[PDB]
Design a protein around this ligand. Sequence first.
Ligand SMILES: [Mg+2]
Ligand SMILES: [Mg+2]
Ligand SMILES: [Mg+2]
Ligand SMILES: [Mg+2]
Ligand SMILES: [Mg+2]
Ligand SMILES: [Mg+2]
Ligand SMILES: [Mg+2]
Ligand SMILES: [Mg+2]
Ligand SMILES: [Mg+2]
Ligand SMILES: [Mg+2]
Lengths: 322, 321, 322, 332
Amino acid sequence: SDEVRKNLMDMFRDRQAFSEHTWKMLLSVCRSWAAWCKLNNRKWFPAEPEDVRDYLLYLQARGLAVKTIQQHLGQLNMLHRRSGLPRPSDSNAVSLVMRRIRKENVDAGERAKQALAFERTDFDQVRSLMENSDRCQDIRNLAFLGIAYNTLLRIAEIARIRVKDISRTDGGRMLIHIGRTKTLVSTAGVEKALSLGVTKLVERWISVSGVADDPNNYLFCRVRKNGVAAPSATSQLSTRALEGIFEATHRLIYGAKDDSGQRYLAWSGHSARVGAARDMARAGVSIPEIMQAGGWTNVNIVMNYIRNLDSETGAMVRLLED
Amino acid sequence: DEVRKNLMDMFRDRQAFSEHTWKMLLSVCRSWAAWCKLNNRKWFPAEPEDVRDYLLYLQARGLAVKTIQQHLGQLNMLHRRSGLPRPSDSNAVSLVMRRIRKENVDAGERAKQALAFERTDFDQVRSLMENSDRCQDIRNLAFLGIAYNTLLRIAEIARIRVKDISRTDGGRMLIHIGRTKTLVSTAGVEKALSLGVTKLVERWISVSGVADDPNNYLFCRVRKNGVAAPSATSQLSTRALEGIFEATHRLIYGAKDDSGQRYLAWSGHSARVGAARDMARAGVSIPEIMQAGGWTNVNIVMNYIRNLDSETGAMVRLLED
Amino acid sequence: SDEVRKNLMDMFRDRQAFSEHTWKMLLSVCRSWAAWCKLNNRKWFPAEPEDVRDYLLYLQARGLAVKTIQQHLGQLNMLHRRSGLPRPSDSNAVSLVMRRIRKENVDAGERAKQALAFERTDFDQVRSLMENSDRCQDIRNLAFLGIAYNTLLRIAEIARIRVKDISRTDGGRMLIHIGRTKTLVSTAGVEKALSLGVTKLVERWISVSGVADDPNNYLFCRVRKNGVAAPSATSQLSTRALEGIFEATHRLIYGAKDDSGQRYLAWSGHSARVGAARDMARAGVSIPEIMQAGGWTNVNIVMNYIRNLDSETGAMVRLLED
Amino acid sequence: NLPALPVDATSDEVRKNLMDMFRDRQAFSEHTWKMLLSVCRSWAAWCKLNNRKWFPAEPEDVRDYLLYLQARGLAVKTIQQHLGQLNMLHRRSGLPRPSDSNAVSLVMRRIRKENVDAGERAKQALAFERTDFDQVRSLMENSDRCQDIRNLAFLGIAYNTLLRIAEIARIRVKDISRTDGGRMLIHIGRTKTLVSTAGVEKALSLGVTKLVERWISVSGVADDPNNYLFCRVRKNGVAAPSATSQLSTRALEGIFEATHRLIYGAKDDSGQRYLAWSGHSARVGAARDMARAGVSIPEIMQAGGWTNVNIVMNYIRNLDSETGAMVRLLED
DNA sequence: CGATAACTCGTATAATGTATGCTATACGAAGTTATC
DNA sequence: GGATAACTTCGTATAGCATACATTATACGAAGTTATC
DNA sequence: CGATAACTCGTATAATGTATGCTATACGAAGTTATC
DNA sequence: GGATAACTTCGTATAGCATACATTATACGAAGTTATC
Ligand SMILES: [Mg+2]
Ligand SMILES: [Mg+2]
Ligand SMILES: [Mg+2]
Ligand SMILES: [Mg+2]
Ligand SMILES: [Mg+2]
Ligand SMILES: [Mg+2]
Ligand SMILES: [Mg+2]
Ligand SMILES: [Mg+2]
Ligand SMILES: [Mg+2]
Ligand SMILES: [Mg+2]
């Protein structure tokens, strides 16, 4: 059809209207669906429902996570909708099998994992331990963790902070201005405030690394073995290096991790969000305020991040033990 | 013609639904089918005109709006999953429900909820079974414990097993919980019993002797004599656990009125509620109260305490100073 | 057309789906329309753009209110849309004229009126004025007012209150349960609790009136010229009668109403709400709490109900004068 | 008026609608018309320079133009304004609007993103808080100058009543009255909104009253109850009352600009917007003072006649009053 | 018995929520006009 | 006649506010309607 | 010249709201089955 | 033998929970890259 190839060209042309992380996965799912269809004698586009259902079952068999499957089906549906054609998920066949694959895998014992918390207590421990060091790297990584736990900002967002995005409240408390977050991309954005002590942690890093030289320099950068920061304004610290700062800081207090081959054996990127999420909940912060804090709107993930007390525990325990 | 194929693909994957869902699906189709072939109308595919009628009837029977929505809603899942236009899509039908709902809301059709099995009630019932030795008595009280101390759903208790209860450094029982029918559980995974409650549970573990085997389901059956008959292939029905509640209430306030009202004596959620309410009187943050019982729809929790004095509103405050 | 006649009929068939007041109007409007149409040689259905424009323009000449004119144009719309036909507001000619009539009228002065406030100050008076009187109606009325101010409930809603709808807090206050309002119409409803002082006033009228002998009795009933309630379960006190209670308690304190024809010349159905909002506003109650107080979900209207303190006024003046 | 609906291009019922639109021009604020005509003018000129039919706008053409407004370095809110007027002009004349098409909808999206990442952000009025009024008032309260007396009065009323400038230029003598307390009370009639969420009446402090009063004594505006409160003052220091011509909002913005230059001196050099007070500073400022003073949002919002808290929240976002829960914990 | 207190009709008009389309402001520069 | 203070008008770049939409309620003078007086 | 600290890339999977479509409880009552 | 105690299995009436949708982001082990030591 003419309309289809035109609708597609429209998209690929203005592909930058999408997250660079959406294109990465679109191509990914496609090249995988590309295979199976060739190695199974199938027309890969437009997708025929019975084949998509077969492809979804193949994925289940491969031992992939419920959510990983939801995405493969997910992108296939996009490529189609954005085309003009109907989605594979518009056919009972495809639709149902998905739910099925979901229902099955849950009972089978599969559940959605989640980052390991880095709570107040941890931040409190990693501070007194590296608080004195004079190493640049050490000075930096502390301010990073400081902001990560104090703002619940995602690593992607921290990595994008520019020195010119920093100002201060009348009281001497720093204020980082965040532009585009995961679920908001506008000219207004929001202002995230740091605690009176973290702002110190950051100040010490701002100076010891001379990034304040050009206000276009990104707050966080690299520090080579000689212990010298490489402030930049075109190259931001990669989110991998930031996920690094956690895994390291964790090793620093618990050494080499398990041999399991499982995720979240050590603090990762999302660790401070869920951590502070808990700490707040535990201190009795209200729903609307725990919201404001994380940039959330609903209450789910928050609830997903809880399981608070185990040993003595509280809530009911504390209550029954009148 | 092609609905034949669709229903195939439909049944070809029936696990795409909970047994409980499938049941009502059938159950409703039956009611539909009947009324249809008595007023003489093709039952499937159903013309929006007949459904309009059908629904109007469920109303005459006196069914609750929630129930009627369940019926109409059930017809839909049948059509959508058969490649047909769902009746909820036609002007006729969607105009009746709006008529019925309002019509019924004005008549006073009011939705109700479980009876609050609160704290003062876990005590009374407690002391009056705290000094008894009937194994069956022990069990029941050792369930009216867990339930209140975990805000666990009944079906969730039925599936707990002696491969789970673990100990605490301080002497508390933790209860791992797996195979939860929830992908993204915004609820717990490890609830811990209190001293008192742990106590009562321990006692039951021995007298019922379920420890013998791990895969053994904690709570089980007890015949008319007083012998716990553990198993690991069948669990103490929810209907049964429901009763443990039912009975315990009878033993204190007597029997139910003859007026067929619902929720006239503790039920499964009777623990949840009271549980919630008590925390609320204690000052537990709404979020804390929600992870205690594993909620996410805070309006629900806001319903189980809607009538405490702590949540009476701001105008009351102003009128008292 | 034919398909139209059907739709029209299905719409009248289940006309119970829409509120009574919606119908009383559709008619009141088609009447006034057709009337104008007959005399001005124009059709009446479908309504023609220019016809509807000259019509809306006519209603403006008669000197009707902007909000009034939007109601005719409005009902007129519901008719056509509801019967599968395009809306006269879907044509540039109509939608532009309606916009115009608003500005032209707003510029000339005409603004919307609003209920006259019946604030806390007034309540305390009305009470310390009838607080004693052992008179039946004098009892009832000071009760209705107590509830009116305390719950901000509209009146039509206070009407439908059945005795089997009252309950209590383990602390002593009443919990009137409301099932259907203006914004919502459900089986879950909400609960409005009264103060100890008002819960008391209500109690006194419950006993002295006799409505209590049957639960399905409407909390408020009439009081015949002698001084005896008329408890029912099939007859609500008319809303008009309730506006009246207000109308008179005002006459009781400020005498005759200055014959001027103007509206809101003395308390009425809403006097209590705007009042309650205002009193809360002055006390510093939060937005989310003023909302719950009146079953509102937007700070608007509450804002409209405010133009607070007169004369000395304050806020920005209290600030400057320190 | 409009650029040139083509003898050929323009045709049939779009000439009908376009006709029906100017018929009820009163349906739009004069300001809206100024922006509609400005965008057309601007698009029409981009079209001639690049050889494109300016109406009806083909999508691929609206897209080249949007990417063009981006490169010119225009702000996203401006680019959407342009897109919006082009969309009105079309729909409000019976044709399919751009952005109602796939191409224009994706560029707009791509442009908004690419832009939010260049680090573009909305700006906002430089605050004129209480301490600035105190400083400005302690320097101009000693002048017998007729212009200096007028301005100190305008600032006082602007900071105290939080009225927009357009509104202040409308206040006419007959609107001022005296409150029992010996202070004034200005009434603001004829708004624009059917429902004015601000306040019919605004009261001034005693201090601000002495300021406004002293301007009335020297300007002789009371000579007629229909004169506007504020007016010109020529080269020679003589006020010039009138009841037919108010001050331009342009000059009221000129009072804020000047008063800021008197205290901090000559402006800057960058083309930076908001380097000195403007006609919206007294509001932003007064809002902040109020917040710092522990006033409730509803009471603040009413003070300034606001209805979407998102704004007053945007004005008091950098206060310590609004720092958040995570800080409170870390600091206990 | 008739006069009264105390309560159905019809037209006019407010209320209810909010994304965004309309409506302000910002500000350099050009054009006016009464005064130095 | 010039130059100039102090505006007014303009036009284009942006910030900010309030309305269309689909009903659902109230406001209020008049009639009409019953039990008491 | 290496060795080493400190930092693209591809597949796999979590995160974002929430209205309403599933899911699970209620409960009378009819089948079960080892005890009394 | 017959009569239960204490449960199951059932079907229909109601309550309450969690997911589909369309992207957008993080996890992390491996391979590649660059100043320093
Ligand atoms: Mg999907
Ligand atoms: Mg303008
Ligand atoms: Mg300042
Ligand atoms: Mg000027
Ligand atoms: Mg000046
Ligand atoms: Mg300054
Ligand atoms: Mg609405
Ligand atoms: Mg000049
Ligand atoms: Mg994959
Ligand atoms: Mg979403």
